[PDB]
Amino acid sequence: MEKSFVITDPRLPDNPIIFASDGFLELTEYSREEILGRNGRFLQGPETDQATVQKIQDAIRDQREITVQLINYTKSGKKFWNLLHLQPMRDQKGELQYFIGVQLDGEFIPNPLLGL
Ligand SMILES: Cc1cc2nc3c(=O)[nH]c(=O)nc-3n(C[C@H](O)[C@H](O)[C@H](O)COP(=O)(O)O)c2cc1C
Ligand SMILES: [Cl-]
Ligand SMILES: [Co+2]
Numbered sequence: 001m002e003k004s005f006v007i008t009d010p011r012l013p014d015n016p017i018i019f020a021s022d023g024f025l026e027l028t029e030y031s032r033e034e035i036l037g038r039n040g041r042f043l044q045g046p047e048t049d050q051a052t053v054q055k056i057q058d059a060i061r062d063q064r065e066i067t068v069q070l071i072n073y074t075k076s077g078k079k080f081w082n083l084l085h086l087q088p089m090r091d092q093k094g095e096l097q098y099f100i101g102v103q104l105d106g107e108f109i110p111n112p113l114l115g116l
């Protein structure tokens, strides 16, 4: 598929998605009109490890890059493992301007090892 990614605007409330790539539409099954303006957490669901979600929340707070592997769900409810790479984007003034999150679909690290 084409690269899956979204770009959020942390200068707006709760880091809304302001751009979603064609690859993200394909991976997630959502239309661009269903995605724009919401927070990336909408892909989570019952099996998502809340401890991983907290690591993401702390990375966003600290404006630090992180990679995690977590369960996400397509529009039709299909589970997928998401190796999610989040990167803060700063402008030439040193100010946070975006986050970008790149999704790679696959159980890259086996779940028995992820669990620790
Ligand atoms: C650019 C960007 C992309 C994100 N993409 C995803 C994603 O693909 N899947 C997901 O589960 N969370 C994704 N998130 C994480 C959530 O948006 C959120 O930061 C996380 O769930 C932690 O915050 P919370 O505890 O308030 O939900 C993304 C966040 C950012 C900033
Ligand atoms: Cl966020
Ligand atoms: Co591809």
Ligand SMILES: [Mg+2]
Pocket (backbone or CB within 6 Å): 041, 053
């Ligand atoms: Mg939550």
